[PDB]
Design a protein around this nucleic acid. Structure first.
Ligand code: ZN
Ligand code: ZN
Lengths: 50, 203, 252, 180, 242, 226, 62, 48, 90, 50, 190, 141, 55
RNA sequence: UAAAUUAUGGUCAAUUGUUAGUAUUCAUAUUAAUUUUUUUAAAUGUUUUAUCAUUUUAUAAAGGUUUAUUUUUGAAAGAUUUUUUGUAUAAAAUUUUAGGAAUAGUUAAUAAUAAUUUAUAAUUUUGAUUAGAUUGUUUUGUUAAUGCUAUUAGAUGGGUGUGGAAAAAUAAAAAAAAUAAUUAAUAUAUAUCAAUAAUAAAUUAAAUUAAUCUAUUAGUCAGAAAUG
C-alpha cells in the first residue's frame, strides 16, 4: 500500500513486505531495494528548493 | 474481475514496467522516459497531467500510525435467534473445528476469531474453551483463555473460576490461582442455614 | 460422507426416501441369522456368571391373556427339552438356517436340535434350541448353567435354550443383547495356585537364540489378470478385513 | 450427475467444487498474455468469478530485464527476471488451512517461489523414476534410527502449536506479592 | 489467413521492427546511392576485419550487390562469414559498423557478455587439447585454441559414437564456469560428451550398475556418498529459538 | 472419509485412488461400496468355438421333429459342458459334483493362492436355484488364517473362476452343521511348522527380478535395442 | 495412433529418421502439415517417451 | 476500477464477520446477475 | 486418466469395452514404482498443508491478540466518551 | 526424507529464515492500518490523512 | 486506455502501467421508438406509450436511491435493513393481522434532497390488541404467511380514544367518506 | 456412463430389456392404445390390459399365465416317456419353479425307453439334469 | 387450487427429533398445529406458579 | 459575539466554437463513438467402471420479466477406532408509458382441513391489474462538476419428483479420479457480435529471428486557397 511504503520497506517492521529473487542457480535471496521500489507506483522526487 | 477480456485485479496492485517486446511503442529497446509520463502513467482525464499514485504522494501521517488504530468500536447487533446461532457455532467450533485433524489451539483460535468477529464470548464459550485445552494439556493456553476472559474485563462465574482453578492445579503454580481468589471468588459465601439454596434467576 | 440434519424436502405424510424397516421373519433363515450369533454370548455369559432368569426350573405358567404380558423377550434354559403350555412345536432341518449355529456349537456343547414354536394364539413364537453333550466351555462353578446340573452330571446332558418373541418384529425388541456382559476365563489362572505351583517353573527372560528365522518359500508373483492396486480400488486387503492404507496381502 | 453433460468441461465431482489454486490467464496475443493466479473452485460457471475465492496474484510469463536496478557486473542479476505477485498469507490460509487443490502450472510457479517443493511434473526426463525394495528400505532404517523423544517434538511443533512459552519466561505471567 | 499480420517477436537486442505503413515510409524515402566516400573498400585501414569477413560471392550472386557497391555504413542486408569461427549470417554493414554486431555464435566466444576479457578462465589449447581433437576441423583452430573453457561458444564438434556434428557450448562441454555465473549441471560433461541421441548410453551404465549392486535404484546414492566421504568439520549451527 | 490412503492428501487428484472410501459415498447409493470384483465380462466369455459343430438341441427342440441322434446329443452334452468350463467352473458346477454339496470344503479362486494372497472360503452352505449354476453359496471365509465368526454369503461363486481340492476330512453331511474352521491364533494355537503365515499386515515381497529387469529395460536403464 | 481423430499413422512419411520424430517441435510440426489434434497428440506421446513412458495404451476408435 | 477510489474488501469482513463472503461464494445461483450484496463501506457511515 | 494398457484384459465383447481394467501383475508391480514416488512426493506436500496451519494459526493467535489489545483500547475509549457525553448531556 | 535432511543439514548456506515459509505475517483479514482508502465524504485516501 | 487519446492508442489488449480496464460501451446510439399502434388504438387503458422508455432500476432518472438514514435508523440500530419499522397501524380487519404503514428513505442525489415513502405492510399480532392508529413498533422474523414477515413488536401509543370507542361499541375509526378516484360522474340523488 | 439420469428412477437397474424408451412414454395416450394392442397381440388375456404404471418387465403373474397357457407340444403321447416328458416339462419347465430335478426323476424317464425316439427323449432329459439344473447323478447311473 | 402450494401454516421443522431421522430412517408424522398454538388461542393465563412445598 | 502564527500540514476542480437586431440546453466545432478497415483464435471423440448395468463430472439457443430470482454438508475440499450433533426457503430499500382505473384460483387466521371452513378479506391514484418497451442495482462517454448518458452475458413452470443442489438434450479452452503432456502459450482460415491500428505517413536504417505489407481521397464566395 503505497501510502505505507516507508513502513513496508523498513526492517524493524515485522509485517514488512516480502520479496524473493530466486536466482538462476536456484538460490533464494531477498530483494534489492531497487526491486522493492519497483513494485509500487512510480515515485517522483525533486526538491526545487535549493 | 479476472480472466474476462477486461482484467482489473492484476493492475490493482503495482507491477513494474514490462518491456519484453514491441507492445506497440518498441517497448523493448526504446526506453521510454517521456513515453511513460505522456502515455502510460494514468491521468486525471485525457490530457491532464500524469497522476502519480506514488508512495511519496500520500500524507506522512499514514506511516506514523500505530496498529489497528483506524479501527473504531463497532457495536454490531444481530437478531436474537441469530445471536443464538452464532453462539452455538463458535461453541461447536471451539469444541471441534475440523473433524479429526485439529491442533488443540483451534478452540483458542475460535474464541479469538469470535472476538475479532466483534462477538461477546459467553461463559460457556469460556468453560468449553478451557476444558478443551485442559484435555489437550495446553495449560499455558487454558491460562491465556483466562487472560482473554480478563482482557475482556469479564466476571468469571463460579463455574469459570472452578475451571481456571483446575488449570492452576494441573500446572502447579499457586500464584496463578491466588489472583483469581483475590479478584473474584472472595464474595462467595457458603450457604448459611437460613438462606435459600438455589436463589432463583433474577435479571 | 456424513449425516445430514433434517428432512426439509418432502411432505412427511408420505414417507419417501426412508431406508425400509427391517423385520426378522421366523419363516425364513433371517430370523436365525440374527438370533443365532446372539445365543453364543449368552452362553459364554451363563458359563461365566450366574444371571437369574436363565436357569429356570420349568416353563412359565401364565394365562393366555398375560402370556404376551411377561413372555415377549423371555429367554431361558431348561434342563431338558419340553414344550411350554399353549404352544405347538415345529422342528427345522433347513441347512441354510442351521449353518449359523456352527460358531455356537464349536464353542459350547454341540447343538442337537432346533425348533420354532408358535402359540395357539399364533402370536408368540419361541425359537427353541436344544443343545447336547459335554460343553466346550470351562463352565464356572458359580455360573447359571452350573446350577443347571449339566456340568455336574456326566456326558449326555441335553439342556435347551428358549427365546420367546412376538413374530414379524424387528431386531430391536429381541432383548438378547442386554446380556453382552463380557466376563473372562479365570480357570486359566487357576493353574498357578493349586499343586502345579511347585511343578511349573516360569522363564522371565528370553533364551540365547543363535539361529535366525527360517524364511518362507520364495515368492512367485501372481499370474492371473489382477483387479489392480487394491489401494486405489478401495478394497480392504482381503475384501474382508484390514485398513485401506494397510494394504497388506493383496497379491504383492 | 447431469442428464446431458457439458463435454469439454467436466471436472470430477459436484457443482461447487473444491477450492483450487488455478493460474488462469486470458489467451490473446502472446505479448498481451499474463496470468491471473488465483484461488478458486474447480466447477465454475463460464467466467472466473462466480466461484472465485480470493485473487492470489499475477505472473509475467515473459522474462523481463533489470530495468529497475542498475547495470551490475553480476551475471545472475543481469539475467532476465520473471516476476509474480502472490498473496502469500491467504495462500497459506487457503492451501494450508482450508486445503485447496494446487494445480500444476500454479505449482510450477510457487515451486520457483520457495513455498512449495518442486512439483511432480518438473520431470528431469534425464533421470529415471525410483525402484522400491523392502530389504534396502528396512536395512537403512535399521542402520540410521531416530528416536521417539526427538520425533514427537517435531511432530507437535510442526503440525501442532509451536510457540513454546519458555518455561523460564512463563515467570512473567505469574504475578508478584500484591496478588502473590 | 489471419495470423500473417502478427508481428515477429522482438527480444532485447532488436530495435525497430519496421512493420507498418508509417513504420517503413519515412525510412523508405531514404534513396541512398553509393558515392566514393560512401564506398566501404575506401576504408580498409580502419575496418580491415569488416572487409575480411564478407561472403562476397554469397552477396553478389544472391543480392546483386558488389563489394565495391558496399557502403561503410550500408543498410542493405548482406551475408557474411565469421573470420574467427566461420559461420554464415545475413547482416548489414550498418549495424556492424555502428554497433559491433556480428555472428550469433561468436557472440558468446567470450565467457560472459558483461565481463568479456577480464576472464582469466584459461584457454582451450593451452588447457585441454582433448577438446582440440574433438572440435570440428576449421583451420581456425589456431585461434580457437585460445577460447576460454568457460565460453558459451556454441562450438561444433565431432562426436565419438555417431561420429557426426554436435554443437554445444564450450563451457557446457568443458564443465568449469567462471566464478559467479549460472552454473551448469553436475553431469553436463557426461550428457554432452556425446551426441544428442548418443549421449544417452554412456549415462545409464553407472545407473543400472547400482540397481544391480544394491537391488534398488534411488538417486540418493550420490548424496550418501558425499556424507560417507565428506565430513563437515565445523559448520556453524544457529542458536535455536524453541 | 473413513479410510482414504495415506490420510487425505492432495498433491494430485489421483493420490486418493479411484475411490476415496471403502464405504459407499452416498447414503442413497448403497451398492457403490467397494467389493473385490472379479471380471464379469471376460469371465463370462464362454468360448462358443467349442460349441460349433454339435447341432445343439433347444428346450423347444423337444419335438420328435427335432430329436437328434443320441450320439450327436452326446456331442451336445460334451460340448455344452466344455462350453461352460471354457473359462472355469462356477462353484455351483464345482460343488455339485463333490459329495454333500461340498459343504466344508475350502474353495479358492485362482488368485487366492498366488501372490501374498492366501485365502480360502471354508464354505458352509450351498443352495441351488431351479437353474443350477446359480443359487446362494454361504461360507466361512478364511484370510491369512482368520475366519469369519458366522457363515457369510460367498461372493463370486456364480462366476466361473473357482477351484477346490476336495479332502475327505471336510466332507460334512446334510445332518451335521458345518463346524467352523479354527483360526490360527485364536481357536488353534500357533505352531511354526504346521502352518507358517505367508504375509503379515506389514509384508510386501522382495522385487521380482524379472519385473525389475523389465522396468529397467523399458525406462531405459537396461539398454534395449532390437 | 489411438484416437479416430489423432491418426498419427497417416504421416509416417513427414519424418525421415527417429531423431526427426524426437526433435521436431510442436510448431515444427505445423511446418509439416500435421493437423492440430494430430500434432498435439504426437507431442504428448513423444514427451511421455522422452521421460520413459512408452505409448503402451489401448486403441479406442473401434 | 482503482481501489483508492473504492472502499476496500476487508470491510465486508469487519461488517458481516470475517470470512463470511465465502459462505456465499459456495452458493448456488451466485454469479448470474446477482451476488450476495457485498457490504464494503466506510464504517463511519453505517445506518446501523 | 486411469490408463488403458494394451496388455490389459481385453473383454472380448462387442457391447461394452474392448479393453478392461485388469493388470498383468507386472502392471500391479510397475504401478508400484508409480504410486510410491508420488507418496514420496506428497509426503512433503501434506507435511506442509499442516505446517501452514501451524503457521497461519500461530500467527492469527498473535495477531488477534494484538488486534484485540488495540481494538480494546479503542473500544474502551469510545465507551468512556459515550459515558462522558452522557454526563454533559445531563 | 532422511537422506535429504542429512544433506540439507550438511548444507551450511541453509539454517536461515525463508520469510515466505516461516510465518504468516498478517493472517487476519484486515490491514493493521488504514491504507489510503476513501473517507466519509469520498475524500479519496490522498485528499485526507489519519 | 481511457486516459489515452484516440490516435495515441496502440493496443486494446493490456494496460501498460496502471489504470482502469473497462469496455468503452457505446452510449451514443440513437435508440428509437417504432410506432406499432395508432394514437387512438392502444392495447393499454391507463398509461399509453408513445416514446422510448428509460429502462433500469437503480438506473432510472431522476436517480432515486436507497437511503437507510431515516427515522428507523435514528431510533433503532439494525442487523439488516428494514428489520424495525414504526408506524400508524392502519388496517387490522384481517383477524389477528395488522397493516403497519411505515416509511423508508428515498434520496435524490442530483437534487441533494430526500423523500421518505409510505408502505402498507402486513404485521402479525397474535391476540388482536392494536387498533387502527396505535403508533406501533414492528419487527421482522420468520415469515408468517404469504405476505406478513413482521409482527407487532410493541405499542408506542395505544389509541385510547379508539379502544374506548370499541368498548362503547362504535367503529374504532369512521370509514372514509368517499371511495377511490373514478372516471364516471356517479349521480347520487337522495 | 450411468443411465441414471436419462431414464426415470424406478428404471434404474434395468438391463437386458430392449429400448426401454417405450415404457417411459407408455402413458401418453397414443402409446397407450399402441400397447393395448401389443398386449392383446401377445394374447393370454381377454379384456384390455397394459403393463402397469411403472413396469417394463411384464408382470410376473401375466408372464406365468402365458407361460402356462402356451400349449406344450407332443400332442401324441404314446410311450411311457412321452407322458413322463409332458409331466417333466410341466414340473421343471413351468414358469418360475423352485424345484430342481432329481437324479431319481431322471432314472424313471431314462427307464421308459422302447424306441430310439425315447432314447433321444430321456437322453435330452439327461442333457438337462447334466447341464441345466446342475444336479449330481447317483452312484449307479 | 385455492392457496399456496406448501403453506407456512404447515411449514414446520421439529428439533426434538434427532438429525437425519426424518431424512432417511424414520417418519415423524404428528399434529404440530396444536403444540404450536398460542395462549390467545387456548386460554393459558400464566398464573403465578407456586413452588413445590407451597404447592 | 476574539483576532494568534509556533507560517503553503490533509497531495492539481476549473469551462479555448465567427457569431449575425432581441428572447431561448438546439445546425457548422471538439471528445467518445458508429460509418471503417482480419496483430485472437481455434478445432473433433468427454473421460474412466466390475459391463447389455453402474461409480465420477449442474445455469450461454430463445422463451418477456419493473412489488421479479431467493436457499445448506449430506456431495467435494475433508485428514480417525465406532454410533456425532444445533448455521438453509425469509426478506428489506429503489421500478418504466402524455393525457390514469379498476384488478382477481383471491388476504388473514386457524390447517401439517375445508374441489361447498370461517370473514366487514386482500391490490390499487404513495399511480393497481391488462397491454408496451425493457436483462435489475462497484465496469463507460462527455463535463471543472451535482448530472446527463452506459456495461454484458446468466434462472422462461410442473409433470416417477433422480442429485448436495434441475440449473440438465450438442455449442471449455478448467486437465476431468495412474506425472500422458507443457521445449509450451501457434491459432486455418474459422467466426462471434466484440476488440479504439494510417503503430517514425516521409533523407541517414532496422546490435532481429528478416516476418506482413507498396499505401490513398479534402476543399478553393464567407473562412487557407482561383483562373481559363
Ligand atoms: Zn561467428
Ligand atoms: Zn554423436
Amino acid at each position: 500500500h503505497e501510502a505505507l511504503k516507508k513502513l513496508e520497506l523498513d526492517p524493524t517492521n515485522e509485517k514488512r513486505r516480502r520479496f524473493v529473487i530466486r536466482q538462476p542457480d536456484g538460490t533464494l535471496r531477498s530483494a534489492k531495494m531497487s526491486e522493492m521500489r519497483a513494485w509500487y507506483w512510480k515515485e517522483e522526487w525533486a526538491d526545487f528548493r535549493f | 474481475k479476472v480472466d474476462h477480456f477486461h482484467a482489473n485485479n492484476q493492475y490493482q496492485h503495482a507491477w513494474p514496467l514490462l518491456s519484453h517486446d514491441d507492445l506497440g511503442n518498441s517497448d523493448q529497446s526504446n526506453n521510454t522516459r517521456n513515453i511513460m509520463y505522456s502515455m502510460y502513467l494514468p491521468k486525471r482525464n485525457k490530457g491532464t497531467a500524469p497522476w502519480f499514485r506514488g508512495a511519496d504522494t500520500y500524507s506522512v501521517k499514514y506511516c506514523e500510525q500505530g496498529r489497528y488504530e483506524y479501527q473504531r468500536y463497532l457495536m454490531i447487533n444481530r437478531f436474537p435467534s441469530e445471536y443464538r446461532k452464532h453462539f452455538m457455532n463458535f461453541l461447536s467450533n471451539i469444541r471441534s473445528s475440523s473433524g479429526p485433524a485439529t491442533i488443540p489451539q483451534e478452540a483458542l483460535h475460535w474464541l479469538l476469531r469470535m472476538i475479532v468477529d466483534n462477538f461477546n464470548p459467553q461463559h460457556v464459550h469460556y468453560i468449553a474453551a478451557m476444558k478443551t485445552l485442559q484435555n489437550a494439556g495446553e495449560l499455558d493456553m487454558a491460562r491465556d483463555v483466562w487472560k482473554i476472559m480478563e482482557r475482556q474485563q469479564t466476571w468469571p462465574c463460579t463455574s469459570t473460576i472452578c475451571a481456571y482453578l483446575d488449570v492452576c492445579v494441573e500446572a502447579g503454580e499457586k500464584t496463578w490461582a491466588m489472583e483469581a481468589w483475590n479478584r473474584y471468588c472472595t464474595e462467595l459465601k457458603f450457604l448459611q442455614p437460613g438462606e435459600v439454596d438455589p436463589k432463583p434467576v433474577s435479571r | 460422507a456424513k449425516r445430514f440434519r433434517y428432512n426439509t424436502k418432502y411432505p412427511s405424510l408420505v414417507s419417501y426416501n426412508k431406508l425400509p424397516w427391517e423385520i426378522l421373519n421366523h419363516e425364513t433363515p433371517e430370523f436365525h441369522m440374527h438370533v443365532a450369533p446372539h445365543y453364543e454370548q449368552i452362553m459364554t455369559l451363563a458359563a461365566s456368571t450366574h444371571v437369574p432368569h436363565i436357569v429356570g426350573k420349568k416353563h412359565l405358567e401364565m394365562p393366555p391373556e398375560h402370556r404376551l404380558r411377561l413372555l415377549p423377550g423371555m429367554f431361558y434354559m431348561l434342563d431338558g427339552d419340553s414344550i411350554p403350555e399353549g404352544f405347538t412345536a415345529n422342528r427345522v432341518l433347513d441347512p441354510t438356517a442351521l449353518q449359523y449355529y456352527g460358531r455356537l456349537e464349536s464353542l459350547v456343547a454341540p447343538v442337537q436340535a432346533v425348533r420354532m414354536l408358535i402359540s395357539d394364539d399364533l402370536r408368540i413364537v419361541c425359537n427353541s434350541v436344544t443343545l447336547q453333550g459335554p460343553l466346550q466351555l470351562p463352565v464356572a462353578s458359580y455360573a447359571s448353567l452350573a446350577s443347571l446340573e449339566v456340568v455336574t452330571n456326566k456326558a449326555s446332558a441335553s439342556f435347551t435354550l428358549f427365546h420367546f418373541v412376538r413374530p414379524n418384529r424387528p431386531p430391536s425388541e429381541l432383548q438378547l443383547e442386554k446380556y453382552y456382559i463380557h466376563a473372562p476365563r479365570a480357570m486359566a489362572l487357576a493353574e498357578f495356585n493349586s499343586t502345579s505351583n511347585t511343578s511349573w517353573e516360569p522363564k522371565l527372560q528370553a533364551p540365547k537364540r543363535s539361529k535366525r528365522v527360517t524364511p518362507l518359500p520364495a515368492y512367485r508373483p501372481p499370474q492371473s489378470y489382477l483387479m489392480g492396486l487394491a489401494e486405489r480400488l478401495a478394497v480392504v486387503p482381503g475384501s474382508s478385513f484390514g485398513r485401506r492404507s494397510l494394504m497388506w496381502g493383496h497379491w504383492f | 450427475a447431469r442428464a446431458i453433460i457439458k463435454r469439454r468441461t467436466p471436472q470430477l465431482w459436484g457443482a461447487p467444487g473444491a477450492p483450487i489454486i488455478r493460474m488462469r490467464g486470458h489467451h490473446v496475443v502472446w505479448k498481451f498474455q499474463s496470468y491471473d493466479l488465483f484461488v478458486e473452485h474447480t466447477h465454475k460457471r463460464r467466467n472466473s468469478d462466480a466461484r472465485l475465492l480470493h485473487y492470489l496474484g499475477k505472473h509475467c510469463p515473459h522474462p523481463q530485464k533489470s530495468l529497475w536496478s542498475p547495470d551490475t557486473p553480476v551475471a545472475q542479476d543481469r539475467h532476465l527476471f520473471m516476476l509474480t505477485t502472490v498473496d502469500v498469507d491467504a495462500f497459506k490460509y487457503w492451501f494450508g488451512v482450508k486445503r485447496c487443490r494446487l494445480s500444476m502450472r500454479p505449482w510450477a510457479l510457487l515451486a520457483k517461489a520457495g513455498l512449495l517443493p518442486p512439483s511432480l511434473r518438473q520431470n528431469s526426463k534425464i533421470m529415471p523414476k525410483p525402484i522400491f525394495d523392502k530389504e534396502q528400505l528396512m536395512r537403512y532404517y535399521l542402520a540410521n534410527r531416530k528416536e521417539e523423544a526427538t520425533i514427537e517434538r517435531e511432530d507437535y511443533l510442526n503440525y501442532k502449536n509451536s510457540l513454546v512459552k519458555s518455561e523460564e519466561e512463563r515467570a512473567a505471567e505469574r504475578p508478584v506479592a500484591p496478588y502473590l | 489467413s489471419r495470423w500473417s499480420s502478427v508481428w515477429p517477436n522482438m527480444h532485447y537486442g532488436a530495435m525497430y521492427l519496421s512493420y507498418s505503413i508509417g513504420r517503413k515510409l519515412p525510412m523508405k524515402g531514404v534513396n541512398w546511392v553509393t558515392r566514393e566516400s560512401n564506398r566501404l573498400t575506401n576504408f580498409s585501414n580502419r575496418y580491415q576485419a569488416v572487409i575480411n569477413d564478407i561472403d562476397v560471392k554469397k552477396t553478389e550472386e544472391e543480392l546483386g550487390i558488389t563489394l565495391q557497391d558496399i557502403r561503410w555504413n550500408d543498410h542493405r542486408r548482406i551475408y557474411w562469414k565469421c573470420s574467427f569461427c566461420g559461420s554464415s549470417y545475413r547482416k548489414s554493414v550498418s549495424v556492424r559498423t555502428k554497433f559491433h554486431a556480428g555472428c550469433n555464435f561468436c557472440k558468446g566466444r567470450y565467457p560472459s557478455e558483461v565481463l568479456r576479457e577480464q576472464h582469466q578462465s584459461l584457454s582451450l589449447a593451452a588447457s585441454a587439447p582433448e577438446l582440440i581433437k574433438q572440435l570440428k576441423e576449421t583451420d581456425k583452430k589456431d585461434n580457437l585454441g585460445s577460447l576460454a573453457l568457460t565460453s558459451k561458444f556454441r562450438a561444433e564438434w565431432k562426436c565419438q559414437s555417431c561420429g557426426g556434428s554436435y554443437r554445444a557450448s564450450v563451457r557446457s562441454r568443458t564443465g568449469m564456469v567462471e566464478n559467479g555465473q549460472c552454473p551448469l549441471h553436475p553431469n553436463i560433461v557426461d550428457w554432452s560428451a556425446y551426441c544428442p541421441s548418443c549421449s544417452w548410453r554412456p549415462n545409464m551404465e553407472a545407473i543400472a550398475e547400482e540397481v544391480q549392486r544394491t537391488g534398488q535404484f534411488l538417486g540418493l546414492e550420490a548424496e550418501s556418498r558425499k556424507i560417507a566421504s565428506a565430513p563437515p568439520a565445523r559448520i556453524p549451527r544457529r542458536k535455536k529459538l524453541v | 472419509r473413513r479410510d482414504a490412503l495415506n490420510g487425505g492428501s492432495s498433491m494430485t487428484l489421483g493420490s486418493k485412488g479411484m475411490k476415496l472410501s471403502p464405504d459407499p459415498h452416498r447414503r442413497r447409493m448403497p451398492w457403490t461400496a467397494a467389493k473385490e470384483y472379479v471380471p464379469g465380462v471376460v469371465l463370462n466369455a464362454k468360448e462358443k468355438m467349442v460349441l460349433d459343430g454339435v447341432k445343439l438341441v433347444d428346450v423347444e427342440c423337444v419335438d420328435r421333429a427335432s430329436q437328434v441322434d443320441p450320439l450327436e446329443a452326446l456331442r451336445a452334452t460334451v460340448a455344452t459342458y466344455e462350453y461352460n468350463t471354457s473359462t472355469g467352473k462356477n462353484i455351483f458346477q464345482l460343488a455339485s459334483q463333490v459329495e454333500f454339496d461340498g459343504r466344508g470344503q475350502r474353495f479358492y479362486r485362482k488368485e487366492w493362492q498366488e501372490g501374498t494372497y492366501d485365502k480360502y472360503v471354508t464354505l458352509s452352505a450351498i443352495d441351488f436355484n431351479r437353474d443350477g449354476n446359480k443359487g446362494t453359496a454361504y461360507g466361512y471365509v478364511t484370510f491369512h488364517g482368520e475366519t469369519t465368526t458366522r457363515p457369510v454369503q460367498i461372493d463370486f461363486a456364480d462366476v466361473p473362476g473357482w477351484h477346490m481340492e476336495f479332502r475327505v476330512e471336510r466332507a460334512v453331511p446334510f445332518n451335521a452343521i458345518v463346524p467352523p474352521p479354527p483360526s490360527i491364533g485364536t481357536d488353534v494355537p500357533v505352531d511354526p511348522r504346521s502352518y507358517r503365515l505367508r504375509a503379515y499386515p506389514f509384508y510386501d515381497a522382495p522385487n521380482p527380478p524379472e519385473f525389475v529387469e523389465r522396468l529397467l529395460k523399458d525406462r531405459g536403464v537396461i539398454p534395449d535395442s532390437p | 495412433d489411438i484416437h479416430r481423430l489423432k491418426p498419427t499413422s497417416d504421416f509416417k512419411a513427414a519424418f525421415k529418421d527417429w531423431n526427426d520424430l524426437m526433435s521436431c517441435d510442436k510448431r515444427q510440426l505445423r511446418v509439416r502439415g500435421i493437423p492440430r489434434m494430430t500434432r498435439i497428440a504426437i507431442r504428448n506421446a513423444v514427451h511421455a517417451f522422452q521421460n520413459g513412458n512408452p505409448p503402451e495404451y489401448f486403441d479406442t476408435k473401434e | 476500477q482503482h481501489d483508492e477510489m473504492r472502499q476496500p474488501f476487508y470491510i465486508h469482513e469487519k461488517r458481516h464477520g470475517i470470512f463470511s463472503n465465502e459462505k456465499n461464494i459456495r452458493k448456488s445461483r451466485r454469479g448470474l446477475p446477482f451476488i450476495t450484496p457485498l457490504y464494503t463501506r466506510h464504517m463511519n457511515l453505517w445506518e446501523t | 486418466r486411469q490408463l488403458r494398457p494394451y496388455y490389459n484384459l481385453p473383454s472380448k465383447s462387442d457391447h461394452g469395452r474392448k479393453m478392461t481394467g485388469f493388470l498383468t501383475p507386472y502392471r500391479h508391480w510397475m504401478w508400484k514404482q508409480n504410486e510410491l514416488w508420488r507418496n514420496v512426493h506428497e509426503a512433503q506436500f501434506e507435511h506442509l498443508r499442516k505446517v501452514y496451519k501451524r503457521q497461519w494459526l500461530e500467527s492469527f493467535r498473535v495477531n488477534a491478540d494484538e488486534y484485540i489489545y488495540k481494538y480494546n483500547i479503542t473500544k474502551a475509549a469510545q465507551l468512556a466518551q459515550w459515558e462522558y457525553e452522557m454526563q454533559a448531556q445531563e | 526424507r532422511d537422506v535429504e535432511e542429512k544433506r540439507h543439514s550438511r548444507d551450511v548456506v541453509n539454517e536461515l529464515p525463508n520469510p515466505w515459509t516461516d510465518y504468516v505475517s498478517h493472517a487476519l483479514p484486515f490491514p493493521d492500518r488504514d491504507a489510503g482508502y476513501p473517507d466519509e465524504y469520498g475524500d479519496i485516501g490522498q485528499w485526507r490523512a489519519p | 486506455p481511457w486516459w489515452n487519446f484516440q490516435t495515441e492508442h496502440r493496443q486494446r489488449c493490456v494496460m501498460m502501467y496502471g489504470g482502469s480496464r473497462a469496455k468503452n460501451t457505446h452510449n451514443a446510439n440513437h435508440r428509437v421508438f417504432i410506432k406499432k399502434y395508432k394514437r387512438n388504438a392502444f392495447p393499454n387503458r391507463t398509461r399509453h406509450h408513445w416514446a422510448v422508455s428509460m429502462t433500469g432500476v437503480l438506473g432510472q432518472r431522476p436517480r432515486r436511491m436507497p437511503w437507510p438514514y431515516d427515522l428507523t435508523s435514528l431510533i433503532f440500530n439494525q442487523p439488516r435493513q428494514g428489520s424495525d419499522k414504526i408506524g400508524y397501524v392502519v388496517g387490522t380487519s384481517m383477524l389477528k393481522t395488522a397493516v403497519v404503514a411505515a416509511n423508508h428513505m428515498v434520496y435524490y442525489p442530483k437534487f441533494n434532497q430526500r423523500v421518505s415513502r409510505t408502505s402498507r405492510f402486513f404485521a402479525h399480532d397474535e391476540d388482536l390488541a392494536c387498533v387502527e392508529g396505535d403508533l406501533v413498533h414492528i419487527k421482522q422474523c420468520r415469515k408468517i404467511s404469504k405476505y406478513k414477515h413482521y409482527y407487532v413488536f410493541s405499542i408506542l401509543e395505544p389509541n385510547i380514544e379508539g379502544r374506548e370507542r370499541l368498548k362503547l361499541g362504535l367503529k374504532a375509526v369512521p370509514p372514509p367518506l368517499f371511495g377511490y378516484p373514478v372516471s364516471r360522474r356517479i349521480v347520487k340523488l337522495n | 456412463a450411468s443411465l441414471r439420469y436419462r431414464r426415470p428412477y424406478w428404471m434404474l437397474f434395468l438391463k437386458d430389456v430392449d429400448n426401454w424408451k417405450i415404457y417411459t412414454v407408455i402413458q401418453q395416450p397414443d402409446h397407450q392404445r399402441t400397447e393395448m394392442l401389443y398386449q392383446a397381440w401377445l394374447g393370454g388375456l381377454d379384456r384390455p390390459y397394459t403393463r402397469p404404471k411403472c413396469m417394463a418387465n411384464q408382470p410376473l403373474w401375466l408372464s406365468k399365465k402365458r407361460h402356462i397357457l402356451r400349449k406344450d407340444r407332443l400332442d401324441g403321447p404314446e410311450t411311457p416317456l412321452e407322458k413322463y416328458v409332458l409331466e417333466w416339462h410341466k414340473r421343471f419347465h413351468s414358469f418360475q419353479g423352485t424345484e430342481r430335478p432329481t437324479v431319481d426323476d431322471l432314472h424313471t424317464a431314462l427307464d421308459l425307453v422302447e424306441r430310439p425316439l425315447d432314447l433321444s427323449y430321456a437322453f435330452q432329459l439327461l442333457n438337462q439334469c447334466r447341464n441345466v439344473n446342475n444336479i449330481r447323478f447317483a452312484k449307479d447311473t | 387450487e385455492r392457496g399456496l402450494y406448501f403453506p407456512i401454516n404447515h411449514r414446520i421443522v421439529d428439533r426434538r427429533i434427532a438429525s437425519g431421522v426424518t431424512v432417511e430412517e424414520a417418519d415423524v408424522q404428528s399434529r404440530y398445529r396444536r403444540e404450536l398454538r398460542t395462549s390467545f388461542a387456548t386460554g393459558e393465563t400464566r398464573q403465578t406458579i407456586p413452588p413445590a412445598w407451597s404447592a
